[PDB]
Subunit: 112 residues, 3 copies
Amino acid sequence: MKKIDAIIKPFKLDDVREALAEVGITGMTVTEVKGFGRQKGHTELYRGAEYMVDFLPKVKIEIVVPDDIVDTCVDTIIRTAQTGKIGDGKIFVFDVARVIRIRTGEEDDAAI
Amino acid sequence: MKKIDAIIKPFKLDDVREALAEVGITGMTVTEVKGFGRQKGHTELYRGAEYMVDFLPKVKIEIVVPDDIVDTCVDTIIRTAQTGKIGDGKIFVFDVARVIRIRTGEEDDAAI
Amino acid sequence: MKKIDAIIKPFKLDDVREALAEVGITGMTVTEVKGFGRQKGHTELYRGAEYMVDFLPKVKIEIVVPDDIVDTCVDTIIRTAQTGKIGDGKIFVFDVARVIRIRTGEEDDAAI
C-alpha cells in the first residue's frame, strides 16, 4: 500500500472527492492548511506584508490505497483538481509499513 | 523508529492520551480533520447533500516512537479507541529517516 | 527527495519561513496542531485537569526537498526556531516515493 497526500485548491475538493468515490475509494481525511508560495500576482514567499497575509488557504487530502490502484488515484486527482494555473499543488506518495483497523484489531497486508 | 498516525473518534482522545501516558510515551500532536466515508446510517461517500454535510469530524494523533515499543502503542490505541462500531478508524505506521531535537540540534538514532 | 515535518513554537514561524525563503525554498504548508507534553511548569502529560487544558498550540510545517539540501533546511530550522527552552519541538525527515505537479501532470525525480 501507499499513502497519497494531495494539497489542492479548496474548491476542487468535491470534484475530487466524487471522482475518487467512482474509482472505488472509500475513506478520506481532509485537513485545512495554510499554503505558502506559488500564488498569482506574487513571486515572493514570506514578503513581510505587515497588514497583508502571505498565505492562501489550502486543502490537504490523505488516503492510503493498494499499489495497483495508486496510478488511477493520481491520474484521477490530477484530472479533477488541475486548473492549469499557478497554485494547483502536488501529490506525494509515501510507503506505509502497517495499517490496522481499530474496530477489529485486524491488519491489512501493507504490501498489496 | 516509526511514526504512528491514528485517526480516531474525537471522544476517545483522552482515554488514548492517558493510556499512552502510562506506557511511557511523552509528546503527542493532535490535528482536527474532516473524516469522509464509513459512517452509521450511510453507505455512500460524497453523497452530494446540498444542505447536508458529508463529513464526520475526526482526530488525528501523531507520535514517533522506538520500533520495540511500536506494538505496545498500537495494541494500546486499539484498546482505548475501539468501540466495535462503524467509524473507528485506522493506525498507519511509517518509517522515519531522521529525528532532530530543535532545542539542542541533537539527533536520535532513527534505527532504534 | 525527503519530506521535513517540523513542529515548532507558533511564534518562530516567520523567522523560519523567511530563513527558508533565503535558502532557495519555495512552497510550504502550515498546519495548526495541539501539542501535548514537554511544557514549562509541567512534568505530566494528560494531567486530567477538569477546567484546565493540557495542550499548547503548535505549528507544523511540511516541505519536500532534494536530498542534497536536506541538511541546509534542518540546520536552518534549528537555527531560526530554537529557543534553548522546553517545548522547542522536533524535525522528522521521511522519504517520498513520488511527487507529481497537479498543474502539468508532470513528475519529479523523487531520487534527487
